[PDB]
């Protein structure tokens, strides 16, 4: 975080090791639950980008999640760069990587955050990190198939492929994944295909289903 | 923009008629100057997407410019959506559905939603994001209409002169400049901005060389 000293200067305040301790525990206990996001946002109140990164590599053991977070950060950074075109000539305005803390110093971070007008790089980067965590949660959650729907015009075989791919990426028990495939494949098919599929009979299986809806 | 009740709610306050009148005056007076952009940014501080659209409706009579803003906005909105794909799953009680491009442009979103995004912890700064799109648009407008745009049209060292001529004239046509300025552009800047080898050939032509004669002279240079 940031604190004002008696000179008026805005200076760094380390995130308490007890705040870090609490963050690692939340992750150990609730990893991939949506509850992680609000906790992260509260834990990281007032964070500079460096603070955010301190928090991030404290759970660095989540190699798979970390690569996904980073790919998402890179994407938001590029979008920032897009809508804030650079301008040479001559504090510099931050690029995406400066907001992510990769190409900026702590001093520069404090400088943007407390400038006039201020550029809240801490809040921007926290939002980007939230986008990454949401992606991860969403991909891993059983809830990801409950809401899948075959498009109104979507070819049934395309839908099937998407269905199984989404299911495969979920971290869920086999019993739940089996219940989903047996129930929700036909249940979440579009209006026109559903009708066709139900009329086949309860013993109808995947290949007959795809032939029956082929063309629609 | 956004203000807090004594009862603690973040509510919307319309842009002041004096801020609006100032912005309208800036556009009236500062035609298409680079100066418009910094002013627009100052005047639109804190604006929600609704407020930004309010400012634009006030200067909407500039139809060719509004058309340019529309195309920019549609383009940026389309990229936002590519970067932010729709996610159909349920929204957790402590999450907030992300805005779409059209939500940011204020088209498919409500003031209440805009305020909900803007004041989230941390924000989803839809006012600032939409403001950036508008600014991208304004920069494209000034760059297109300003007589300044042709000045950096320079023939490449290996560019066929006919291609350079096309670029030059296309840029010329799209500018809002007086005829006497455009006459200087065609009669002197075109040669001025030719590459070293073509310029030397062009400058050794007669008093009344026609553009067709120029193209003939510089073919394969
Ligand atoms: Fe914060
Ligand atoms: Fe990457
Ligand atoms: Fe961004
Ligand atoms: Fe701050
Ligand atoms: Fe700024
Ligand atoms: Fe910040
Ligand atoms: Fe988000
Ligand atoms: Fe197939
Ligand atoms: Fe699969
Ligand atoms: Fe069914
Ligand atoms: Fe088909
Ligand atoms: Fe605000
Ligand atoms: Fe106002
Ligand atoms: Fe000036
Ligand atoms: Fe409008
Ligand atoms: Fe969505
Ligand atoms: Fe959130
Ligand atoms: Fe409201
Ligand atoms: Fe965002
Ligand atoms: Fe905003
Ligand atoms: Fe912002
Ligand atoms: Fe310009
Ligand atoms: Fe070339
Ligand atoms: Na980056």
- Give the C-alpha Rg of chain A: 24 Å
Bound molecules: fe (iii) ion, sodium ion
- Largest interface: chains, residues each: A-B, 29 and 23 residues
CATH A-level architecture of the largest domain in chain A:
Orthogonal Bundle
Terminal residue distance of chain A: 58 Å
Summing up helix and strand content along with how strands pair, one would put the structural category of chain A as mainly alpha
* Shape summary of chain A: elongated
The overall strand count of chain A is 2
Estimate nothing, just give the exact number of structural domains of chain A: 2
Give a structural overview.
- The structure is a homodimer.
- Chain A has 216 residues and is mainly α.
- Chain A has 2 domains: 1-142, Human Immunodeficiency Virus Type 1 Capsid Protein, CATH 1.10.375; 143-216, Retrovirus capsid C-terminal domain (Non-ribosomal Peptide Synthetase Peptidyl Carrier Protein, Chain A, Orthogonal Bundle), CATH 1.10.1200.
- Chain A is built from 12 helices and 2 strands.
- Chain A has helices at 17-30, 36-43, 49-56, 63-83, 96-99, 106-113, 121-140, 143-146, 156-169, 174-187, 191-198, 206-213; strands spanning 2-4, 10-12.
- A two-stranded antiparallel sheet of chain A has the order 1-2.
- In chain A, a hairpin with a 5-residue loop joins strand 1 (2-4) and strand 2 (10-12).
- The longest helix of chain A has 21 residues, at 63-83.
- Chains A and B meet through helix 2, helix 4, helix 7 and helix 8 of A and helix 4 and helix 7 of B.
- The structure holds fe (iii) ion (FE) (23 copies) and sodium ion.
- Residues 15-16, 19 of chain B line the site of one fe (iii) ion (FE).
- Chain A: Disulfide bonds join 193-213.
- Chain A: Belongs to the primate lentivirus group gag polyprotein family.
- Chain A: Fe(3+) 3 binds at residue 123.
- Chain A: This is Gag polyprotein.
């Amino acid at each position: 975080p940031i604190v004002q000293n008696i000179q008026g200067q805005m200076v760094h305040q380390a995130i308490s090791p007890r705040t870090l301790n609490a963050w690692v525990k939340v992750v150990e206990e609730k990893a991939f639950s949506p509850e992680v996001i609000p906790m992260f946002s509260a834990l990281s109140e007032g964070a500079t980008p460096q603070d955010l990164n301190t928090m991030l590599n404290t759970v660095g053991g989540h190699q798979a999640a970390m690569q996904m977070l980073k790919e998402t950060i890179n994407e938001e950074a590029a979008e920032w760069d897009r809508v804030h075109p650079v301008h040479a000539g001559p504090m510099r305005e931050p690029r995406g990587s400066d907001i992510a803390g990769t190409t900026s110093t702590l001093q520069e971070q404090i400088g943007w955050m407390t400038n006039n007008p201020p550029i809240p790089v801490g809040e921007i980067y926290k939002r980007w990190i939230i986008l990454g965590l949401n992606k991860i949660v969403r991909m891993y959650s059983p809830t990801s198939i409950l809401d899948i729907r075959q498009g109104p015009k979507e070819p049934f075989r395309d839908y099937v492929d998407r269905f199984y791919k989404t299911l495969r990426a979920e971290q869920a028990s086999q019993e739940v994944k089996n219940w989903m495939t047996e129930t929700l494949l036909v249940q979440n098919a579009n209006p026109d295909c559903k009708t066709i599929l139900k009329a086949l009979g309860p013993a109808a299986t995947l290949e007959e289903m795809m032939t029956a809806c082929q063309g629609v």
